[PDB]
Amino acid sequence: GSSGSSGKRMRTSFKHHQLRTMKSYFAINHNPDAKDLKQLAQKTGLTKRVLQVWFQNARAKFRRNLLRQENGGVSGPSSG
């Protein structure tokens, strides 16, 4: 019951092309399976690792803009 927990983190820059494929996917599937990972490593060129991380970082980042005022779709005070 451990998906390998180690203290390894780093930040790097990315292009607008490769990302387009990744970011777009993030919306399709937050938890991409190996197949998807290996498939993305090509559509973007990055490596499985780089992908796995980047994706994981997103979930953390979004959580921020998610609670912040900024938001999509129709929503309001209406009991929901």
Side-chain angles (χ1 to χ4, degrees):
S2 278
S3 69
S5 200
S6 180
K8 286 183 86 74
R9 67 273 83 65
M10 209 194 234
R11 73 270 314 165
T12 57
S13 305
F14 305 106
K15 307 283 168 83
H16 282 141
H17 273 283
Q18 30 150 101
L19 270 183
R20 189 81 177 80
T21 302
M22 276 206 287
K23 293 156 84 279
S24 187
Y25 186 105
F26 177 58
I28 304 170
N29 198 31
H30 288 213
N31 296 300
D33 276 329
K35 169 66 181 276
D36 289 287
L37 275 164
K38 60 168 88 155
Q39 274 271 71
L40 282 164
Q42 289 276 272
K43 297 198 199 294
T44 67
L46 310 161
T47 187
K48 202 156 163 181
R49 170 82 62 198
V50 166
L51 301 161
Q52 277 290 57
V53 179
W54 182 98
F55 270 77
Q56 285 167 341
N57 272 286
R59 302 204 281 182
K61 202 205 286 83
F62 196 96
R63 274 179 69 177
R64 189 191 160 76
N65 48 240
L66 160 64
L67 90 81
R68 187 68 177 279
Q69 192 155 22
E70 291 312 326
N71 206 292
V74 178
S75 199
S78 79
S79 208

